[PDB]
Each structure stands twice: as C-alpha cells, then as structure tokens.
A paper describes a structure:
Inhibitors in the P4P5 series aim to further tap into the unleveraged part of the substrate envelope with a hydrophobic P4 moiety and a P5 capping group. Larger cyclic unnatural amino acids were also incorporated in the P4 position in P4P5-3A and -3B, P4P5-5, and P4P5-6. The cyclohexylglycine P4 amino acid in P4P5-6 yielded the most potent inhibitor in this series, comparable with the best inhibitor in the P4 series (P4-7), with potency of 0.91 ± 0.38 nM and 9.68 ± 0.64 nM against the WT and [name] variant, respectively. Six crystal structures of the P4P5 series included P4P5-2A and P4P5-2B in complex with the WT and P4P5-2A, P4P5-4, P4P5-5, and P4P5-6 with the [name] variant. In spite of creating a frustrated pocket, the P4P5 inhibitor series demonstrate a trend similar to that of the P4 series, in which increasing the size of the cycloalkyl P4 group led to better potency. Importantly, not only the size but also proper orientation of the P4 group toward the S4 pocket was required for better potency. When the cycloleucine was oriented away from the pocket (P4P5-5), potency decreased, while increasing the P4 group from cyclopentylglycine (P4P5-3B) to cyclohexylglycine (P4P5-6) led to a 30-fold and 90-fold improvement against the WT and [name], respectively. The binding and interactions of designed inhibitors in the crystal structures, particularly those of P4-7 and P4P5-6, confirm the need for PIs to optimally fill the S4 pocket to be more potent.
Residue numbers in the entry: 983 to 1179
C-alpha cells in the first residue's frame, strides 16, 4: 500500500518533421530527461508538428494529432497520462477494442485533417521518417508496395497513414508479418477516430 508504485506518464521525446520537402526525425529530449519527465509528468518543452515521438519507461512509439486530438495505440500507451507543462493529462479517449487512445492535442502542435478523398493510394510515416507507399486493401488493411522486414516498422505504431493530399487516413496499429517480412499493415481508420469523438 505505502510501497505501491505509480506508472509514469507518456513523454514526447521528438517529432517527425514533415514541413519541408524532405522528412526527417528530430529528437527533443534524451533518455535521462525522458525518465525524469515520465515520473513528474511535467514537460515544459515546446511542441511542434503533427507526428510526435513518444516514450514510456519501457517503450517508444508514435502519436499523431488529428482534429485537435493526439492519438496513439493502446498497446503502447495503455491508460497512461501524458506529460504536459501543467502536469500529467488524463486520456480523453480510451478504446481497447480499437487499440486506440487519445489526449487533447498539446499547445503548439498542428493537426492533420481527416481524409475525405476516398483514395486508396496511401503513405505510411515511420519513426525513422520513412514515407512508405501503401495501397489500401480494406477498411483497416493495406499492403506495402515494397515489402521489408518488420524491424523497419517496429516502434511506428501511432504514426499516420496519409492520402496523396496529406490528409490523415488512419493510425498505424499492427504489421501483418510473413516469415518476418511485413507485406501488409493494419491501421485504425480515421472514420473510426471521427466516430469516437
Ligand atoms: C502472421 O501473424 C501476424 O503477423 N499477425 C499480425 C500481428 O499480430 N503482428 C504483430 C507483429 C509484432 C512484430 C513487430 C511489428 C512491427 C511494427 C508494429 C507496428 C506495431 C508497432 O510498432 N508496435 S510498437 O513497436 O510501437 C510497441 C510494442 C508499442 C511499443 N504494432 C504491434 O507491434 C502490435 C502490438 C501487438 O498487436 C496488438 N496488441 C494489442 C494490445 C491491447 O491491449 C494491451 C489492445 C489491442 C491490441 N491490438 C493489436 C493488433 C503485436 N503487434 C504486431 O504488429 C496481425 C494479425 C491480424 C490482426 C493484427 C495483428
Ligand atoms: Zn485525402
């Protein structure tokens, strides 16, 4: 009871810059600063962009702002709070059946617009700033035009799938693996997010 620990907050440690003509990852906080920020829940670093790199004490993945909400996967964030300038912020969306959670998008971040193009030529943004062409194959599945080992997708859950116009189409959730090669991906449709809201 007196010994009972508390799980830490999710911490933004970087972002995927998509504003220029070349996408690249940027780190905003190191391991030591991340661990301390996770314990206190107070992150006073300025936030920028749409795709954040987030970390727990044991895991690192991505979070994407869509319509004023920072979305990520439940299997990464759990029910954890996210660190903010004023302290830990409680999740405003939690859906384990969709593998989806969400916080209020932090001040300074920019949001992606939900896609209404109905296009199936998608692009997956990974934590290493790779922009992978993906063809939509269903409501929540897509095939990589160039298959590659799952290692390249590890840590990219919560990242966006974009349409040709840059709209958000879904949130990267899982990789369909065949002998270690990711030929397909599963994602949370943007409409499923829009519903939850
Ligand atoms: C042939 O068999 C199969 O391949 N079958 C696959 C198949 O299972 N693949 C595996 C291959 C892993 C190996 C690495 C994959 C690489 C990248 C992957 C993008 C990422 C990712 O990056 N994570 S991460 O690194 O950021 C991390 C762990 C946060 C820090 N997702 C990812 O790792 C997924 C997490 C697990 O899945 C789910 N956990 C939960 C848990 C919940 O409460 C706790 C509630 C809902 C929920 N919902 C899931 C679908 C395993 N994950 C897979 O992707 C399909 C089968 C059909 C439906 C979906 C899964
Ligand atoms: Zn679109």
């Amino acid at each position: 009871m007196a010994s009972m620990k508390k799980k830490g907050s999710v911490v933004i440690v970087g972002r995927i810059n998509l504003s220029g003509d070349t996408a690249y990852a940027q780190q905003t906080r190191g391991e030591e600063g991340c661990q301390e920020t996770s314990q206190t829940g107070r992150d006073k670093n300025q936030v920028e962009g749409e795709v954040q790199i987030v970390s727990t004490a044991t895991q690192t993945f991505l979070a994407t702002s869509i319509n004023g909400v920072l979305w990520t996967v439940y299997h990464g964030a759990g029910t954890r709070t996210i660190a903010s300038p004023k302290g830990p912020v409680t999740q405003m969306y939690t859906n384990v059946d969709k593998d989806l959670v969400g916080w209020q998008a932090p001040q300074g971040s920019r949001s992606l617009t939900p896609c209404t193009c109905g296009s199936s030529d998608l692009y997956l943004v990974t934590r290493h700033a790779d922009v992978i062409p993906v063809r939509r194959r269903g409501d929540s599945r897509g095939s990589l035009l160039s298959p590659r080992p799952i290692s390249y997708l590890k840590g990219s859950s919560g990242g966006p799938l974009l349409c040709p116009a840059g709209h958000a189409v879904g949130i990267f959730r899982a990789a369909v693996s065949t002998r270690g090669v990711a030929k397909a991906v599963a994602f949370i449709p943007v409409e499923s997010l829009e519903t939850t809201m």
